[PDB]
Amino acid sequence: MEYLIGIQGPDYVLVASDRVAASNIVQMKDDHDKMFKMSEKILLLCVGEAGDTVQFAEYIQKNVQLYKMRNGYELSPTAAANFTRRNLADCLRSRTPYHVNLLLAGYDEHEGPALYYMDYLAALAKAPFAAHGYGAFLTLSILDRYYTPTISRERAVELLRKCLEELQKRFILNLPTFSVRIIDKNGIHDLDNISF
Amino acid sequence: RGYSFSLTTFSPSGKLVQIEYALAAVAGGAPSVGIKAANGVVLATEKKQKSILYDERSVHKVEPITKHIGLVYSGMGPDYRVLVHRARKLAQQYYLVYQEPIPTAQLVQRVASVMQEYTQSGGVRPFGVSLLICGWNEGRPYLFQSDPSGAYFAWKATAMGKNYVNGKTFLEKRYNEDLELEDAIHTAILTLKESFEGQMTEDNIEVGICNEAGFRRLTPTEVKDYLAAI
Amino acid sequence: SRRYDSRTTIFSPEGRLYQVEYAMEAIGHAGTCLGILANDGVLLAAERRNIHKLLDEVFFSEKIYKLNEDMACSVAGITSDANVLTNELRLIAQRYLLQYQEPIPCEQLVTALCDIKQAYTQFGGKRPFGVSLLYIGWDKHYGFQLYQSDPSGNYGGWKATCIGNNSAAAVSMLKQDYKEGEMTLKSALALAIKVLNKTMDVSKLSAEKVEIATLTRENGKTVIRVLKQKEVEQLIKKHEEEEAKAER
Amino acid sequence: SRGSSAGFDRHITIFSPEGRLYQVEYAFKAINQGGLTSVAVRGKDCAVIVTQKKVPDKLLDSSTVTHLFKITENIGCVMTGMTADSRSQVQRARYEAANWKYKYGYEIPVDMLCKRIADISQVYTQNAEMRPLGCCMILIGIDEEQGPQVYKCDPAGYYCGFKATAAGVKQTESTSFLEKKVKKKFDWTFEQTVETAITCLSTVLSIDFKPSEIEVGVVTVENPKFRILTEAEIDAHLVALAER
Amino acid sequence: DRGVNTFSPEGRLFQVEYAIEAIKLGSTAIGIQTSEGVCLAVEKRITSPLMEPSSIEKIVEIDAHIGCAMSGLIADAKTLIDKARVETQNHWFTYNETMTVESVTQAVSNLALQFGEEDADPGAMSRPFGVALLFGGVDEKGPQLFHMDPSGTFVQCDARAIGSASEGAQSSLQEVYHKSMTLKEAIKSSLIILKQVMEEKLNATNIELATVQPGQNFHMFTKEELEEVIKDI
Amino acid sequence: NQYDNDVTVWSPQGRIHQIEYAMEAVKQGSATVGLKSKTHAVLVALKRAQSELAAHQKKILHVDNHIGISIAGLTADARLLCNFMRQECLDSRFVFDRPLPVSRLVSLIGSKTQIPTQRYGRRPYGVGLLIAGYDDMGPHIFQTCPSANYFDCRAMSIGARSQSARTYLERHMSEFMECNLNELVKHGLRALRETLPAEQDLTTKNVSIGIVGKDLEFTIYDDDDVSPFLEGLE
Amino acid sequence: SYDRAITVFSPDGHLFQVEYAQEAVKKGSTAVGVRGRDIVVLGVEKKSVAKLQDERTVRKICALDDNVCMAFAGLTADARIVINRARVECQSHRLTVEDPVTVEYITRYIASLKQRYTQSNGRRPFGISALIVGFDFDGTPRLYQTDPSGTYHAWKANAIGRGAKSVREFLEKNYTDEAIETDDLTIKLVIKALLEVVQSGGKNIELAVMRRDQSLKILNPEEIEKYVAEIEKEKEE
Amino acid sequence: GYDLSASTFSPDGRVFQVEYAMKAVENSSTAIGIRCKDGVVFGVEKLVLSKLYEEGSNKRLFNVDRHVGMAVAGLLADARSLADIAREEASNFRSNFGYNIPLKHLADRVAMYVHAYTLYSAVRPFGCSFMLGSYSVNDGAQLYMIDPSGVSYGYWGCAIGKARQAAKTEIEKLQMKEMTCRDIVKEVAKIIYIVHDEVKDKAFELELSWVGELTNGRHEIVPKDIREEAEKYAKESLK
Ligand SMILES: [Cl-]
Ligand SMILES: [Cl-]
Ligand SMILES: [Cl-]
Ligand SMILES: [Cl-]
Ligand SMILES: [Cl-]
Ligand SMILES: [Cl-]
Ligand SMILES: [Cl-]
Ligand SMILES: [Cl-]
Ligand SMILES: [Cl-]
Ligand SMILES: [Cl-]
Ligand SMILES: [Cl-]
Ligand SMILES: [Cl-]
Ligand SMILES: [Cl-]
Ligand SMILES: [Cl-]
Ligand SMILES: [Cl-]
Ligand SMILES: [Cl-]
Ligand SMILES: [K+]
Ligand SMILES: [Mg+2]
């Protein structure tokens, strides 16, 4: 059980993900990264079945980078989200479906920040905030309660923390640390891990 | 085995000579005429029919594609039958998807595309045929020609086959837009009579009409009626 | 069979591709076709070869094809070949829209068709397509754009160009009169007529003998229109008035 | 033009500068290589096929020398031209008829069978890698509405129905003989159909036949099944003719 | 013009004969087999001082116990060398042993004559390979040198030259070769011979030399090791 | 001229020049001899060495315990055909648990090698074989040709100056059936020696020997192993 | 599918289609590469000028990946195919190796692609030569060249296309430690090498640079004219 | 030139490649078949090109089914290929229909295969002619011959190869309809000896086979003792 979260402010998208790789009753890695850089202003966050998750995300990543090399400019976040969706949907009924749940976060020069949610069935929804994993059941209502559309990034990192503190308090799984990144006009920034 | 190389290629002056030579087969074919009237279309053709021995009803040059589209040709008969068969199949494929009879222009475009293939695909020659295709849809008549290259053209009236240059000039003199179908049938037959040789009968010409009720061949008795004035 | 194969996809001794060169001669004889880029739009103007009195006039144009919401093209050369390529362009454009849910950028559509043309010069033993194309378009990356492609599978972007009959002379007239950065659709149109007037030395220019299409932007939407005959006759009139003013 | 040629237009089925297909023309000459002529005639009641039966070699089993073939129970055929090509085309006809009955539940009409074979032949005139078949097929059968039928198809893929027709070496002369004869008949229709067929063939060849020198096949409105006449039956016709 | 699989009236395949003529356009390579190991030596044939001599590799490792020298159309040799590398590794995978020099050579030689244009996959080989190869190595038969040409004929040789001056070089090899010759003598002899036949003045940058010995793995001589051997010659 | 480049083109004399040309590849190969007694089949081959420092080309190949071959003509075609023969033998033991009869294997060769003689863009096999075998019907020597024809032989020679070897074999063939193995191999060597220029001799470097028989699986003798057979010749 | 053998041997061991492909390269615009100490520079002669051209759309210097670029001479449509193939392969490498390609790896890939099109049925060879430049992961600068045959080598400096012979002559005489000791001089060498052959005293020269870790920077006309004036006033003394 | 491909007619409507294949047959030594009251007998003049060959090498008589023999002339590798096609056709017929293939049908099927090689530049015509012979109580004796064009006819007597005409002249003298296989084998041997040119080709073997009432409808080699007496009769008749 893996957790992803995104929160879109006016000019930025904040994303976080747990850093655990688990197997059976053990955590096998405590500094795992569930984020994939697609381009200077796009992150794909990918969870789900082992093998499928990295294979799918890295395929998308290489194709996004290829588009940049072929054309001299990048796909927009929206175009990248639709490209991702097309591939997942096209594989749904094939001999090689990918059992993956995703967020795509991006910043476009002209359209601003965008956050997209996709499930393994390949339904795509744009959202102001979203979360995947069992931890979403405990945190989405906190986001519904405290969010606003104009939420500043200092305040957004607090809101994120409340979600993460709620997992420490109430969720049955041990998820002690989280990767945190923010995207804006100036590209992808690493923030400090949030750790307990 | 199938040869995979094109048998039609560019000459140093930029000509596709196999297509030009296919056009020469069409030019030596028996004459055909098409006239778009205000309320319908007529297609008319001469039978290159020797012999009283032929059963003139056994094979037709004027052929239905659908309830509303028909065609005739000049050039090589057997090649024509290929295109008739393909046109009929294209029209049904369209109907199965859209559940509406194929528009005349759409049918023409699809048949023309087949003709184009035979100018480029491996191990074949172009068709030695030009088609005249008539139809009625969107409350309006249509007359098209499709040539051995796969080029097509919409006409008010035209002629093809032997003596077509003079047939077109005969039609230029005689066609007007307000003309009705019955008058047009008459002028189509007169246009054939310009280059006929050997006395016209209802057995050595074929006539098809297209209007709001659909496409059909004229019967021998109907053609005999129109021939009495000529 | 080796005896009959004319070997359409081999090099000649000087490194030339003869079928491509010969296809280029076919194009040089086809109807004159020009493209002009302006600040507020892009136009195509073509000599009509369908001019016989008994022709019926059933489509909106003869040689101008809409490719998608934001692009059109015109053609010079073998018409049936042009029909195959224009159909393929439309398909490529819809495949890209399906995948990305945005319109295909203009240069990407041109490049994709040019890769098919290139393949026909390198393998498969088939004759090349005897077509050159002019493409006009708008996209969000480079705005108003004009491309040209030919049977080698080469292409380029132009402010103004010409293909088909008397191209060389048309390009000279464009080099001299085109004002880089300063053309409007109104002035590009005036120039298009000036050029066709000089390069159609088969007789006194008439609205029935040309087709003009414009591509503009209105309220965040691309508008592609084929000018009506009334408009074209007016442009020809204004050109003939201007040549009279020209002396004194 | 007037017999012009460019490139490979005498070797494969591409157009000559006049728009001819020389390879198809040459396939017609191949029909005459075998030195035989066939005649077919239809009336109101029957359709008949007659062809020469040449057995020069005494060591042949003459019962195996035939150019008449059953396609279905109700469709007969005479083949003229290159023998192995002919046998192939007869096999294809048999297959097409059988397949038609399986798919559609009724017997293939003679016109439709003739058309199918002619459409198959058309392919060989447009595709370069194979030659046309150097043979001509004449088919007879009874159509339930139109009565007796005679159809012919050729290596160009042309086909037609006829009142009477011929094929092979004396095709032209047979056509003149049959034309001249029908014009005399009321409603331009043959009446003595077996006698017309035999007389036409005898006249154009100048032979006066023995019963072992021709073969005859028939279909009739009363007996639609294709039937080959015996020698004795052929002889009763030759003797009836001889006495007038 | 005729097909690629046409025999001449003398019973040779034209394309193979022509491929054999292409070998003569190649730079000279020499192989010598001794009881102490085999050496392979090749003229680099540098065409400009701006070219990096280390980017000419006309001797390659096939596996630790087998090297290969090439002459002719060098680009053609790549698929052959790769096939040799892959076969040795397949053999190791399956049998857990090193493949013999003869067996590697045989595997590569089975690709020669697999060309032609109506029979095979959509873009199969259209012509033979314009390459000759010297395979030098050590297996349980001891040191071995094999030669292969575009016909797919392969044979063991005590000493062999290939490429443009191979006549010439082969005559000198007859003169100097003997069965009890040491590896160090063979190395000296092959550089003396290269020095004679080379149009350019031989130095430590315009030749390559490699050995394989029962002792040790395939070894490409470094510049300094070449300089040392070049002193005597 | 126009009839000699394609195996699908008959000449006006009823010949196929590409097949004839493929047979020249065998006539220019080094000579090989095959012969048999009532109990053994033997192959003897002259090996060419390109230069004085080269090993001598292999001429004799193992096919199965009861079958071996000697080759003349294109080496790569010989390997291809030898691999086909090997596979047919393995298949027979796999399916039937018994050796493939030699005459049936030769039939398979005839069928396999005929195919490319009839299809455009293919070519004949440019190799001739002598096939030595032993089965329930005893010893055999067969010959295969680029034409796809094959022959059942009392003895045979193919390759350069093989007419000489054939003349020797005809001269002595009435003796072969009753010969012991030593005598039979000697006959093979004498025949092969007829092919040589006057100066030259059979040596341990240029002779290869293959033997199969009632009590002896197909065995190849080269280099020092041919010495017993070469001594007490002449 | 079309399976004719197109590239075949002729008497004397010639591959005529490959030789003709090389003729196509020789009629292409001149392209130069020099490998510097911590920089690699490509310069190419433009097409025919043409005032009405959109310059951006006909560049002959192309990024393959962030750390590798190439120039070519010969048939521009063929080059586009080769470039886009190499771009795909750079992404496969990153996918399976999790390193960028070495310049040598991608060169070797492009060369073997070209060799395959000289030995496969139904296809003619690619009518291009390429100069491939960049840096290896360890900072080492690289310049390779491929030709239609599939042959490739590494160069300190090189020229392909029309007038490559005399441009190579110039480079042989002018490529020293001194002439590449700095970035500017490496760049001014390349421009000097082109100005040897370039018809209208350029004007019609495209130029691009790659620095260690820095990705392809193309120079604008304004930046080129500055080097040109700076070189011309130096050649007065 | 109009004679290089079986897919090209000449201007007179000939297929020269088929005619050239026929010339290969006409260069070969002679084979004959004779149908008689109670079976069919084959004989072949089998030229021995080397005394090194085994008696029995390069058979020109084949069993194609238990009731069907085949006798060939022309290019022997092509002929053996056709014998395999005939065998496969017979085997497939039995598997599919459940009884032994009628001779006439077998002839017609293999003839159509031969014919298929006369239409295309992709393949060449077979350089052989062959006879097929059988006997059964229901169908009697049957003898067919098939040539490179794919024509197939039935015969009382037939000959193929270079002395075909000379052989047919001798076969015509026999009242074969009233003779038994045992009588006819002698006559077959006699005729092969008559048409053999002993000056121009030095050595031959007579190959004989038969199928008839006396073999119970099985195609078999003529027993050695009967062949040897037939040869002695032929030799003495040559007197
Ligand atoms: Cl082909
Ligand atoms: Cl139909
Ligand atoms: Cl409908
Ligand atoms: Cl109707
Ligand atoms: Cl759209
Ligand atoms: Cl769109
Ligand atoms: Cl049924
Ligand atoms: Cl009557
Ligand atoms: Cl060599
Ligand atoms: Cl040999
Ligand atoms: Cl060889
Ligand atoms: Cl032979
Ligand atoms: Cl020999
Ligand atoms: Cl590839
Ligand atoms: Cl160059
Ligand atoms: Cl014969
Ligand atoms: K054909
Ligand atoms: Mg799975």
Side-chain angles (χ1 to χ4, degrees), chain E residues 114-126, chain F residues 121-122, chain G residues 1 3 121:
Chain E
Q114 292 188 45
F115 58 86
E117 59 163 80
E118 20 243 326
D119 62 323
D121 91 63
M125 303 288 179
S126 70
Chain F
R122 295 284 287 290
Chain G
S1 107
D3 284 335
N121 288 331

Side-chain angles (χ1 to χ4, degrees), chain C residues 68-69 94 97 103:
Chain C
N68 67 4
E69 217 52 30
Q94 292 306 306
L97 182 60

Side-chain angles (χ1 to χ4, degrees), chain C residues 3-52 54-197 199-203 205-208 210-238:
Chain C
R3 193 174 348 134
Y4 310 125
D5 186 354
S6 81
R7 297 186 165 74
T8 57
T9 61
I10 71 171
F11 287 113
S12 88
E14 302 195 1
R16 297 154 71 170
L17 295 168
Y18 279 141
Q19 282 296 294
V20 173
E21 298 194 12
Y22 298 171
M24 287 166 172
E25 294 292 312
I27 293 151
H29 297 327
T32 308
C33 179
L34 63 84
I36 309 179
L37 173 69
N39 288 165
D40 67 323
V42 212
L43 71 86
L44 289 164
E47 181 185 0
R48 290 184 78 165
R49 284 288 155 89
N50 298 347
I51 56 160
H52 187 297
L54 296 162
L55 291 167
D56 189 37
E57 209 74 290
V58 143
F59 305 105
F60 282 111
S61 83
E62 179 191 305
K63 299 173 97 180
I64 313 249
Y65 300 77
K66 194 174 170 193
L67 301 179
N68 67 4
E69 217 52 30
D70 297 315
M71 300 186 63
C73 70
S74 200
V75 303
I78 308 301
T79 299
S80 65
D81 289 4
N83 293 336
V84 172
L85 299 178
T86 57
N87 184 65
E88 187 60 27
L89 287 156
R90 289 165 172 175
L91 287 162
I92 291 160
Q94 292 306 306
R95 290 196 282 255
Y96 181 103
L97 182 60
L98 175 53
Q99 179 153 106
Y100 296 110
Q101 294 299 130
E102 52 164 45
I104 189 167
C106 304
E107 191 171 6
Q108 296 183 225
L109 181 56
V110 176
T111 299
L113 185 73
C114 290
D115 293 351
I116 296 174
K117 293 196 271 175
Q118 188 282 338
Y120 271 76
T121 76
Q122 185 158 35
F123 64 91
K126 308 299 190 294
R127 67 174 187 79
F129 294 96
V131 196
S132 288
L133 295 91
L134 299 188
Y135 313 79
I136 64 176
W138 185 93
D139 65 48
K140 71 187 173 179
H141 298 104
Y142 303 112
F144 296 114
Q145 291 158 81
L146 165 64
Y147 291 96
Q148 177 175 325
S149 71
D150 67 42
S152 57
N154 282 290
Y155 77 96
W158 295 89
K159 287 158 161 82
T161 186
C162 190
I163 54 177
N165 194 41
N166 291 334
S167 299
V171 56
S172 308
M173 295 186 64
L174 296 168
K175 285 196 220 279
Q176 295 235 69
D177 291 358
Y178 184 90
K179 309 297 202 184
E180 174 157 10
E182 317 191 90
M183 304 299 288
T184 64
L185 197 67
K186 262 176 214 208
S187 77
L189 259 349
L191 176 55
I193 277 163
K194 186 162 192 284
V195 174
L196 294 178
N197 192 71
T199 65
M200 288 176 69
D201 279 293
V202 187
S203 212
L205 188 73
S206 139
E208 277 158 57
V210 302
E211 279 189 335
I212 295 172
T214 66
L215 187 153
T216 53
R217 291 283 285 175
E218 282 169 31
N219 294 331
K221 200 194 72 56
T222 298
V223 178
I224 293 167
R225 207 172 42 86
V226 180
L227 304 200
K228 23 276 355 289
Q229 285 228 11
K230 207 78 174 146
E231 280 179 288
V232 179
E233 292 178 29
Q234 273 271 275
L235 291 174
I236 288 173
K237 229 69 196 185
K238 289 187 188 84

Side-chain angles (χ1 to χ4, degrees), chain C residues 1 5 7 9-15 17 107 114-115 118 121-125 142 147 152-154 157-160 175, chain G residues 2 4 6 17 20-21 23-24 27 50-54 56-58 75-78 80-81 117 122-127:
Chain C
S1 161
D5 186 354
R7 297 186 165 74
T9 61
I10 71 171
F11 287 113
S12 88
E14 302 195 1
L17 295 168
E107 191 171 6
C114 290
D115 293 351
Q118 188 282 338
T121 76
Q122 185 158 35
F123 64 91
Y142 303 112
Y147 291 96
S152 57
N154 282 290
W158 295 89
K159 287 158 161 82
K175 285 196 220 279
Chain G
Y2 182 66
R4 183 78 52 251
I6 284 181
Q17 284 292 303
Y20 303 161
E23 294 292 314
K27 289 207 253 72
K51 167 165 86 72
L52 300 177
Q53 190 96 251
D54 194 311
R56 179 190 69 68
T57 71
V58 291
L75 293 182
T76 57
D78 285 20
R80 191 181 58 253
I81 296 313
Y117 277 62
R123 303 150 184 195
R124 61 162 175 84
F126 288 104

Side-chain angles (χ1 to χ4, degrees), chain A residues 49 52 97 99:
Chain A
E49 190 178 316
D52 294 3
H99 300 149

Side-chain angles (χ1 to χ4, degrees), chain A residues 172-184:
Chain A
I172 55 160
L173 299 190
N174 185 4
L175 292 185
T177 63
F178 301 83
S179 311
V180 190
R181 298 192 170 88
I182 296 171
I183 307 181
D184 290 9

Side-chain angles (χ1 to χ4, degrees), chain A residues 110-149:
Chain A
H110 298 288
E111 307 290 86
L115 176 73
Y116 289 98
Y117 178 101
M118 195 185 303
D119 76 329
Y120 74 97
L121 295 178
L124 177 63
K126 186 177 186 301
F129 55 80
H132 272 295
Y134 295 141
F137 289 108
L138 289 169
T139 55
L140 281 162
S141 68
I142 298 175
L143 301 165
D144 293 323
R145 170 67 184 82
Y146 295 111
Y147 179 95
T148 48

